[PDB]
Amino acid sequence: NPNHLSYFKFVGRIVAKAVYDNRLLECYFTRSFYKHILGKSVRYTDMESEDYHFYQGLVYLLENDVSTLGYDLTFSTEVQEFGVCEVRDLKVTEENKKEYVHLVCQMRMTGAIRKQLAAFLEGFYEIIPKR
C-alpha cells in the first residue's frame, strides 16, 4: 500500500482513541510492539514467538564460545524492508555479544517495520502523552 504509513498512523490514532475513551479493542500486540509503543527495548525471549530459528541462533550464541561458530561474525545483518533486502550495520567478541543479542533483536523487530512504527507512535502520542 503506497499510503500504508498514513494508515498505520490512523490505526495508532484509533488505538490511542480507544485508550483515551477507556474502551477495549481486541488488539493483542506482541510484547515487542507494546515495548516500542512504550519505548522499551525488547528481550531475546520475545524472539521465540516471532522468529524461533533466530532466537535459536541467539541461544547458540549465548552460553557458547564464539569458537563454536568456526567463522567470524560482525555487527551487520541482512534485513528485508519494504521487500528490498539490504545488509545493515548494527553499530564480534565475548564483550560485544551482550549488545549484539540486544541490538540484533532491535534490528529484527523494528528495522522492517520502523516507519510503520514511527507512524503508529505519532498517531498515539498525538492523543496520549508518551510519559
Curated annotation (Swiss-Prot):
Signal sequence range: none
Tissue expression summary: Weakly expressed in heart, brain and placenta but not in other tissues. Expressed in a number of cell lines, predominantly in those from colorectal carcinomas.
Domain of life, source organism: Eukaryota
Localization in the cell: Cytoplasm; Nucleus; Mitochondrion
Post-translation changes: Phosphorylated on tyrosine; phosphorylation is probably required for its ability to inhibit TP53 transactivation.
Chain's role: E3 ubiquitin-protein ligase which mediates ubiquitination and subsequent proteasomal degradation of target proteins. Regulates apoptosis by catalyzing the polyubiquitination and degradation of MCL1. Mediates monoubiquitination of DNA polymerase beta (POLB) at 'Lys-41', 'Lys-61' and 'Lys-81', thereby playing a role in base-excision repair. Also ubiquitinates the p53/TP53 tumor suppressor and core histones including H1, H2A, H2B, H3 and H4. Ubiquitinates MFN2 to negatively regulate mitochondrial fusion in response to decreased stearoylation of TFRC.
Clinical disorder: Intellectual developmental disorder, X-linked, syndromic, Turner type: An X-linked neurodevelopmental disorder with highly variable clinical manifestations. Common features consist of moderate to profound intellectual disability, delayed or absent speech, short stature with small hands and feet, and non-specific but recurrent dysmorphic facial features such as macrocephaly, microcephaly, a broad nasal tip, deep set eyes, epicanthic folds, short palpebral fissures and a short philtrum. Patients may manifest other features, such as hypotonia, seizures and delayed bone age.
Family (UniProt): Belongs to the UPL family. TOM1/PTR1 subfamily.
Subunit structure, interactors included: Interacts with isoform p14ARF of CDKN2A which strongly inhibits HUWE1 ubiquitin ligase activity. Interacts with MYCN, POLB and CDC6. Interacts with isoform 2 of PA2G4. Interacts with NR1D1. Interacts with AMBRA1. Interacts with HAPSTR1. Interacts with HAPSTR2. In hepatocytes, interacts with PAQR3; the interaction promotes PPARA poylubiquitination and STUB1-mediated degradation.
Domain remark text: The HECT domain mediates inhibition of the transcriptional activity of p53.
Protein name: E3 ubiquitin-protein ligase HUWE1
Organism: Homo sapiens
Gene name of the record: HUWE1
Parent-record interval covered: 4100 to 4237 of 4374
